[PDB]
């Protein structure tokens, strides 16, 4: 992921089949001649898409040019949460299924996995980061405090950002409850709030679409993960 001063990011296409699939997902959603109401609504929850991009001198090197969801923030606090009960897709091999379940064998039970966070601490004007091993170490007993950490700025819990997050996730859940044409595996929600007195800006966007597939069913694992995440955030409001 390359961050560009124009308010965009360039995401390098992953090797096939993942990179090509993510490209085609964005092309499908953002097709200029799209009149599918489901897809037009989905656009609101994705980074804006500016098409495929390559360097002028390197047509081989393929990127997606996307809105930088963090651009409007002064001190963005960022968390990436993988959503669903399964982080492997319908065409995964036995080995891949085993790999993915072994990365986090609680995915079926919890329905989400924190991939990382970067949190602004007001007292020290500095960021604290957690890597992939943080979320993979969370259990049912520790998931609430694990998530809470994202919203704690060193002196208080940002319940404003928690409540805003619930409200934005709820609109995404509504979209999911009103479509049966796409299932999303190994995709994430990106949470951003303002760390730096009306810093009430919050973003929750869907990202990472290397494993989205056509379907004829509600995405039940995704819905389960969103509901559980909402449940956890709601309990944090009682702290
Ligand atoms: N559109 C975006 N705006 C801001 N940050 C982004 C955006 N897309 C990705 N990122 C950041 O880059 C990280 C990795 O991007 P992602 O699409 O998940 O790639 P990967 O397929 O390598 O997991 C995310 O966790 C997020 O912090
Ligand atoms: O973050 P880590 O610990 O390196 O582990 C990776 C992580 O689970 C990725 O989400 C996954 O890609 P997919 O979500 O696309 O499966 C990747 O699979 P890969 O090794 O097959 O790329 C894993 O190696
Ligand atoms: Mg990702
Ligand atoms: Mg990915």
UniProtKB/Swiss-Prot annotation:
Keywords: Acetylation, ATP-binding, Kinase, Lipid metabolism, Magnesium, Metal-binding, Nucleotide-binding, Nucleus, Phospholipid metabolism, Phosphoprotein, Transferase. Pathway: Phospholipid metabolism; phosphatidylinositol metabolism. Ubiquitous, with the highest expression in skeletal muscle, liver, placenta, lung, peripheral blood leukocytes, kidney, spleen and colon. Changing residue 99 to R: Decreased activity with inositol 1,4,5-trisphosphate. No effect on phosphorylation of inositol 1,3,4,5-tetrakisphosphate. Substrate binds at residues 18, 82, 96-103, 132, 211. Its main location: nucleus. Belongs to the inositol phosphokinase (IPK) family. This is Inositol polyphosphate multikinase. The gene is IPMK. The chain holds residues 65 to 416 of 416 of the full protein.
